[PDB]
Amino acid sequence: DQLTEEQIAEFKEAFSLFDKDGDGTITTKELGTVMRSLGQNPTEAELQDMINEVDADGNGTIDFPEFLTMMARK
Ligand SMILES: [Ca+2]
Ligand SMILES: [Ca+2]
């Protein structure tokens, strides 16, 4: 079950969907854009709560290693 390049690319592609400006972090705005693509209508505060759940380093936004937590949710 060793990590594959296929999986790594899947993780990077998924991160990039959210991180649309390529700056390496997912903001509330970026997360909101993906939520709205899914027909959802979260508020800024709700988006911040979503980020808070995985924002290990407390900088208020999602980086790539934090995003992996999301990929692991069942
Ligand atoms: Ca970004
Ligand atoms: Ca963070």
Swiss-Prot record:
Ca(2+) 2 binds at residues 55, 57, 59, 61, 66. The modification Phosphothreonine is found at residue 43. There is a cross-link at residue 20 (Glycyl lysine isopeptide (Lys-Gly) (interchain with G-Cter in ubiquitin)). Ca(2+) 1 binds at residues 19, 21, 23, 25, 30. There is a cross-link at residue 20 (Glycyl lysine isopeptide (Lys-Gly) (interchain with G-Cter in SUMO2)). It is found in: Cytoplasm, Cytoskeleton, Spindle; Cytoplasm, Cytoskeleton, Spindle pole; Cytoplasm, Cytoskeleton, Microtubule organizing center, Centrosome; Cell projection, Cilium, Flagellum. Residues 6-41, 42-74 form the EF-hand domain. The modification N6-acetyllysine is found at residue 20. Belongs to the calmodulin family. Calmodulin acts as part of a calcium signal transduction pathway by mediating the control of a large number of enzymes, ion channels, aquaporins and other proteins through calcium-binding. Calcium-binding is required for the activation of calmodulin. Among the enzymes to be stimulated by the calmodulin-calcium complex are a number of protein kinases, such as myosin light-chain kinases and calmodulin-dependent protein kinase type II (CaMK2), and phosphatases. This protein has four functional calcium-binding sites. The N-terminal and C-terminal lobes of CALM bind to the C-terminus of KCNQ1 in a clamp-like conformation. Binding of CALM C-terminus to KCNQ1 is calcium-independent but is essential for assembly of the structure. Binding of CALM N-terminus to KCNQ1 is calcium-dependent and regulates electrophysiological activity of the channel. The C-lobe interacts with KCNN4 channels in a calcium-independent manner, whereas the N-lobe interacts with the S4-S5 linker of KCNN4 in a calcium-dependent manner playing a role as calcium sensor and gating the channel. Homotetramer. Interacts with CEP97, CCP110, TTN/titin and SRY. Interacts with MYO5A and RRAD. Interacts with USP6; the interaction is calcium dependent. Interacts with CDK5RAP2. Interacts with SCN5A. Interacts with RYR1. Interacts with FCHO1. Interacts with MIP in a 1:2 stoichiometry; the interaction with the cytoplasmic domains from two MIP subunits promotes MIP water channel closure. Interacts with ORAI1; this may play a role in the regulation of ORAI1-mediated calcium transport. Interacts with SYT7. Interacts with MYO10 and MYO1C. This is Calmodulin-1. The chain holds residues 3 to 76 of 149 of the full protein.
